[PDB]
Amino acid sequence: STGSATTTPIDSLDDAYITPVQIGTPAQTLNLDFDTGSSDLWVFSSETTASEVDGQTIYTPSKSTTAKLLSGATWSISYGDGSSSSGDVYTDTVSVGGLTVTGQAVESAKKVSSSFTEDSTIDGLLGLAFSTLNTVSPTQQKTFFDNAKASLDSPVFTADLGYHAPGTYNFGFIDTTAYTGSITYTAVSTKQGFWEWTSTGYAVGSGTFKSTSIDGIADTGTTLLYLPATVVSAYWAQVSGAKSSSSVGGYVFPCSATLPSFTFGVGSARIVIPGDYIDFGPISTGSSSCFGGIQSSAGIGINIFGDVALKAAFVVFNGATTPTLGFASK
The missing domain is CATH 2.40.70.10 (Acid Proteases)
Known part of the structure; x- marks a missing residue:
């Protein structure tokens, strides 16, 4: 299999890039920041403290027929820029650009730091570093790429980011x-x-x-x-x-x-x-x-x-x- 999705700068400075991701059944499309420096797929959600949501699209697991609470699992992450988020965990179907993973850990935010709240364009992160960095406890979870890898035509993904323009993330082919x-x-x-x-x-x-x-x-x-x-x-x-x-x-x-x-x-x-x-x-x-x-x-x-x-x-x-x-x- 393969996938291909367009990634789009969030603003005129290319401060970050967002890529649409389908979560759940029926699909809930969230715009995630694909991050090769971290290993958690986390989202703004119906569980996120209401005062910490300001314009983001949320994942509502209760409306997904394929969502399952991962019993006892929590997560908490701090990023190099001082921002942070934490919450609980569901498994659900996640698709990127036509590539589908079933049973993906979707980390639902209960709390997010101010920098996330203040950025209405980013609905969460999709980590693409190695799964050894994943923060889910007590059972560490795999990244989207790690889960997809065996099914891909070739075990690769590519980043083609644009300058002041959209670009592409491809999975499984060059x-x-x-x-x-x-x-x-x-x-x-x-x-x-x-x-x-x-x-x-x-x-x-x-x-x-x-x-x-x-x-x-x-x-x-x-x-x-x-x-x-x-x-x-x-x-x-x-x-x-x-x-x-x-x-x-x-x-x-x-x-x-x-x-x-x-x-x-x-x-x-x-x-x-x-x-x-x-x-x-x-x-x-x-x-x-x-x-x-x-x-x-x-x-x-x-x-x-x-x-x-x-x-x-x-x-x-x-x-x-x-x-x-x-x-x-x-």
């Missing part, structure tokens, strides 16, 4: 028309539960490529590109007037600037992030100070190849017995 040149595959460590790999280096603009190993994670659920302070300083040094602002919380730059591209290595291959992908707009409405899309990972504890990086590529998440990651230009 669309050879969706990229240029070849896909370069690179080793993955699953030791921390992530799609963790090592970039071979970087360049700023038309500058010389610096060969250096950068361990990090391919994370569709993180907006920006978080890299070591040395790398980030070298990038922003090429933007006149750019500076790190502790009050704002990272590098800012004059909105009048033209940003240089940023290149990262994948083996001997090179992925080029155009400068415009690195612009996240005014820090506050009407400001002429703009927020940068490349930021320091210092104090995160890990480098993160988030959407800024991934949307410059066609990315293969190869869930073979020994997982790997593939990157192509597009």
Whole structure:
């Protein structure tokens, strides 16, 4: 089997991407944030504290004839950005782009943090990291991909995120028309539960490529590109007037600037992030100070190849017995 679904930016900055997901019988369609950095499929629901729901579409398990309460199971998750959610668990039928999994754990939120409430466009998350990170207790549950894997034509999914435009998540096949040149595959460590790999280096603009190993994670659920302070300083040094602002919380730059591209290595291959992908707009409405899309990972504890990086590529998440990651230009 295969599936194919369009993923759509939630706003004009590509702060996140939402993908429609059918849950239950009859289907209840929710727009979920596909997150290769976590491993829970959780949703706003009829059980969510009412004051914490503000415009989201909810899953109502009592209206699904295939929903079953997973007795005694609870979940609770905290994300790198400080947000969190928790609740109980149902199993139900879940379909993405025509690919159906029966018995999928659907984690129903009883509580969500303010950042989730305040984002009316995201109805929940669909985790696509390794199932070892799933938070369901006392019996850990499998991701949608893990459940689908054996049935797929090939045990893979691909992320093709757009810049200021829709893109595609495919399951079970590689669309050879969706990229240029070849896909370069690179080793993955699953030791921390992530799609963790090592970039071979970087360049700023038309500058010389610096060969250096950068361990990090391919994370569709993180907006920006978080890299070591040395790398980030070298990038922003090429933007006149750019500076790190502790009050704002990272590098800012004059909105009048033209940003240089940023290149990262994948083996001997090179992925080029155009400068415009690195612009996240005014820090506050009407400001002429703009927020940068490349930021320091210092104090995160890990480098993160988030959407800024991934949307410059066609990315293969190869869930073979020994997982790997593939990157192509597009």
